[PDB]
Structures are given as structure tokens and as C-alpha cells.
């Protein structure tokens, strides 16, 4: 829908901060598709209860490792392109 | 398109180094669309002749401000998503 599936399969190498965050949620590899990165980020957000209890599509990442990476205090999980961009800033795409 | 049309219109604010570079090929503003940033980078690459004479789609940015911004010694200009990624690290989205 919002992101083409070919792009979701884009092979990527998270920078150290992002990678540590993925590892804290059980990620084992140093390379991932963007889909895998997103799944693991969903896991982190949910386990740390970063979503707002009342408005569960709003993630409050301020004062969390995630907000340091994304550089915003909050975001909507409905804006896929913005999220992809914030993630792209924290990785290298692989050849 | 490997880059959707609307991603090209994304409003962005270059960080100081990338903005120095854009200004060096005539950039007047402090915020831009991604399309405009690419254009100015294209002119930078062409004016400094960072493309390979033999393989004109390959850019050798090693040992140049560009390569320091991009974090690679070379890249192909057909790798659009890589390129947008390398640029995005050097700016803030508005
Ligand atoms: O009842 C309703 O009204 C809504 C119920 C509903 O529609 N959906 C339930 C949600 C499915 C969630 C499981 C799969 O989601 C993900 O893996 C996922 N990963 C993310 C990473 C980031 Cl940085 C942000 C959000 C999500 C997220 C998720 C979430 C989510 C929300 C809160 C939370 F704590 C964790 C995940 N909701 C939808 N999604 C899907 C999605 C996938 C990719 C992108 Cl770019 C954006 C969204
Ligand atoms: O058949 C052939 O022989 C090749 C002929 C051909 O198709 N030539 C077309 C060249 C058009 C150049 C005009 C527009 O290009 C750009 O503005 C542009 N900007 C860029 C910035 C970077 Cl970081 C890298 C490449 C370019 C680039 C360019 C270049 C280019 C190549 C070498 C060079 F010295 C300068 C620009 N070629 C095509 N493009 C288009 C383009 C636009 C966006 C993206 Cl993500 C990637 C590519």
C-alpha cells in the first residue's frame, strides 16, 4: 500500500545504535530487510509501552533510545514513509 | 521509479557540511526539496568530474567532501535508494 513491497525487501545494515536496539529485542543478524527492521522496532515499541495507552497509533519516543535515533518526540504509526525515512537515517543500504 | 514521486518533493534542511557543498555550486536557500538537493549534487559531481570517464555512471567520491558525507568511496548513480539514504543522513526533514 503506502510502501512498495520491493522496497520493504531492501537489504540494510543498521548503524550501531539502531543495531543495539534491535539486539535488545532478540535480533541476531548484522543485516536485515527493511521488513525485519520494522518488525523488531514494533516489538521494542510494544515491550517498552512507548505507544500511548489512549491513542495507540501514537508512539512517544522522547527520552528513549528510539527518540534519539528518530529525532522526534512522537510520531504516528500510520505515516509509513516518514518512518522509513527516520529509519533510513540510521543505516546503510547494502550493494 | 525506485523513488516515488512524492518522496522527491520531501522538504529537507541540509546539515552544515552538505549545505556548504550545495552553496559551492550556487545554492541560495537553507531548505529544499530532495529533488533540488539531488540536482545540486549532480552539478557538484559533474563540475568536479567525480564520475568515471570510462564508466560515467560510477561516481568516485573517495577523498572528497562528498565521500565524507556519503560514507562510501564510490557508488553507482543507478542505485537511487542508496543515494537517497546517504543524503538523508546529512539533513533533517522539515
Ligand atoms: O483496532 C484498531 O483500530 C487497530 C488495530 C490494527 O490495525 N492493527 C494492529 C497492529 C499490527 C501490529 C503488528 C505489526 O506491526 C509492526 O511490526 C510494526 N513495526 C513498527 C515499527 C515502527 Cl518504528 C512503528 C510502527 C510499527 C508497527 C505497527 C504498529 C504498532 C503500534 C504500536 C506498537 F506498540 C507497536 C506496533 N501498528 C501498525 N504497525 C504496522 C506498521 C508497519 C510498518 C510501518 Cl513503517 C508502520 C506501521
Ligand atoms: O545512455 C547513456 O549513455 C547515459 C545517458 C543518460 O541517461 N544521461 C542522463 C544524465 C542526466 C543528468 C541530469 C540529471 O541528473 C541529476 O541531476 C543528478 N543528480 C545526482 C545526484 C547524485 Cl548524488 C548522483 C547522481 C545524480 C544525477 C544523475 C546523473 C549523473 C551522473 C554523473 C554525473 F557526473 C552527474 C550526474 N546521471 C543521472 N542522474 C539522475 C539521478 C537523479 C537522482 C538519483 Cl538518486 C540518481 C540519479
Swiss-Prot record, chain B:
Residues 2-85 are annotated as: Sufficient to promote the mitochondrial pathway of apoptosis. Phosphorylated at multiple sites near the RING domain by ATM upon DNA damage; this promotes its ubiquitination and degradation, preventing p53/TP53 degradation. It is found in: Nucleus, Nucleoplasm; Cytoplasm; Nucleus, Nucleolus; Nucleus. Disulfide bonds: none annotated. Residues 2-94 are annotated as: Necessary for interaction with USP2. It is linked to Seems to be amplified in certain tumors (including soft tissue sarcomas, osteosarcomas and gliomas). A higher frequency of splice variants lacking p53 binding domain sequences was found in late-stage and high-grade ovarian and bladder carcinomas. Four of the splice variants show loss of p53 binding. Lessel-Kubisch syndrome: An autosomal recessive progeroid syndrome characterized by short stature, pinched facial features, prematurely gray hair, scleroderma-like skin changes, small kidneys and consecutive kidney failure, followed by severe arterial hypertension. E3 ubiquitin-protein ligase that mediates ubiquitination of p53/TP53, leading to its degradation by the proteasome. Inhibits p53/TP53- and p73/TP73-mediated cell cycle arrest and apoptosis by binding its transcriptional activation domain. Also acts as a ubiquitin ligase E3 toward itself and ARRB1. Permits the nuclear export of p53/TP53. Promotes proteasome-dependent ubiquitin-independent degradation of retinoblastoma RB1 protein. Inhibits DAXX-mediated apoptosis by inducing its ubiquitination and degradation. Component of the TRIM28/KAP1-MDM2-p53/TP53 complex involved in stabilizing p53/TP53. MDM2 RING finger mutations that failed to ubiquitinate p53 in vitro did not target p53 for degradation when expressed in cells. Belongs to the MDM2/MDM4 family. Interacts with p53/TP53, TP73/p73, RBL5 and RP11. Binds specifically to RNA. Can interact with RB1, E1A-associated protein EP300 and the E2F1 transcription factor. Forms a ternary complex with p53/TP53 and WWOX. Interacts with CDKN2AIP, RFWD3, USP7, PYHIN1, and RBBP6. Interacts with ARRB1 and ARRB2. Interacts with PSMA3. Found in a trimeric complex with MDM2, MDM4 and USP2. Interacts with USP2 (via N-terminus and C-terminus). Interacts with MDM4. Part of a complex with MDM2, DAXX, RASSF1 and USP7. Part of a complex with DAXX, MDM2 and USP7. Interacts directly with DAXX and USP7. (Microbial infection) Interacts with herpes virus 8 protein v-IRF4. This is E3 ubiquitin-protein ligase Mdm2. It comes from Homo sapiens (Human). The gene is MDM2. The chain holds residues 18 to 110 of 491 of the full protein.
Amino acid at each position: 500500500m503506502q510502501i512498495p513491497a520491493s522496497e520493504q525487501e531492501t537489504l540494510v545494515r543498521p548503524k550501531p545504535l539502531l543495531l543495539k536496539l534491535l539486539k535488545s529485542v532478540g535480533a541476531q543478524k548484522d543485516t536485515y530487510t527493511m521488513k525485519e527492521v520494522l518488525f523488531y522496532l514494533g516489538q521494542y515499541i510494544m515491550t517498552k509501552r512507548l505507544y500511548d495507552e489512549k491513542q495507540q497509533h501514537i508512539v512517544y519516543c522522547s527520552n528513549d533510545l528510539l527518540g534519539d535515533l528518530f529525532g522526534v518526540p512522537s510520531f504516528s504509526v500510520k505515516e509509513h514513509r516518514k518512518i522509513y525515512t527516520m529509519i533510513y537515517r540510521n543505516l546503510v543500504v547494502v550493494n
